[PDB]
Amino acid sequence: GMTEYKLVVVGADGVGKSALTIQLIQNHFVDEYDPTIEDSYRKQVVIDGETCLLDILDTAGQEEYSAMRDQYMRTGEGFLCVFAINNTKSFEDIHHYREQIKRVKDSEDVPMVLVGNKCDLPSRTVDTKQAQDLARSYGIPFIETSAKTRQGVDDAFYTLVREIRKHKEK
Ligand SMILES: Cc1cc(N)nc(-c2c(Cl)cc3c(N4C[C@H]5CC[C@@H](C4)N5)nc(OC[C@@]45CCCN4C[C@H](F)C5)nc3c2F)c1C(F)(F)F
Ligand SMILES: Nc1nc2c(ncn2[C@@H]2O[C@H](COP(=O)(O)OP(=O)(O)O)[C@@H](O)[C@H]2O)c(=O)[nH]1
Ligand SMILES: [Mg+2]
């Protein structure tokens, strides 16, 4: 049997949620993906010898807090909170995503990774120390990624799976 891990990718428009997801699954950079499409993708992987199935929701669309939308998000076991290292506003929004996840999950201990995407670009408007400090304040890992080159992408998703696997053992 293989365990299935339900992962949700969140963050502002344009941070690279779709490119990160498509890069992880299909091993290629999709540069101008329709910003309005939300979809889910699966991939069979081996993490620390465990053959398992990832089910990843790439979020998009309207911000809305209906009971049905909350319940759908509540089925997520782990969350990647993504910002772009060249977009200060996307980094300022991270606290909001963390707050909504903690509310629907009814806990401060939710498997989560802070992802600083577009690390292939030299314009670091978001300070590295500030992002590391934010991740430290939540007790979660901070991983820099590039959906373009795949740098850090497997590490971000596999770290999240390791956090879920550990959370289920509590
Ligand atoms: C657990 C949970 C429950 C639940 N019901 N919904 C969510 C959720 C989702 Cl699914 C999408 C959001 C979203 N959109 C999806 C994509 C990205 C931007 C746009 C709209 N298209 N935007 C915002 O906030 C946007 C900002 C800017 C304007 C005012 N808001 C408040 C802050 F300033 C940030 N939050 C979002 C959000 F919270 C979540 C969670 F957290 F998991 F994502
Ligand atoms: N250079 C670079 N561009 C990226 C990267 N990830 C995404 N992009 C670009 O940033 C834009 C937004 O990406 P997208 O996947 O649509 O973001 P989403 O709105 O969060 O789904 C697109 O023009 C992508 O080509 C990355 O790691 N590096
Ligand atoms: Mg998208």
Cβ(13) – ligand 2 distance below 6 Å: yes
Q: Resolution, in Å, please?
A: 1.4
In 3D space, the residue among 126, 169, 164 whose CA is nearest the CA of residue 5 turns out to be: 164
- Residues with Cβ within 8 Å of 64's Cβ and at least 6 positions away in sequence, in order, are none
**Ligand showing the shortest atom-to-Cα distance for residue 17:** 2
Q: Please, which experimental method was used?
A: X-ray
Both tokens assigned to 79: 């969350």
List the end-to-end C-alpha distance of the chain, in Å, as a whole number: 22
Euclidean distance between CA atoms 168 and 27, whole angstroms: 29
Euclidean distance between CA atoms 82 and 100, whole angstroms: 14
Q: How far is CA 162 from CA 58, 59, 112, 148, in A?
A: 20, 22, 10, 24
CATH for 2-168 is 3.40.50.300
Cβ(60) – ligand 1 distance below 6 Å: yes
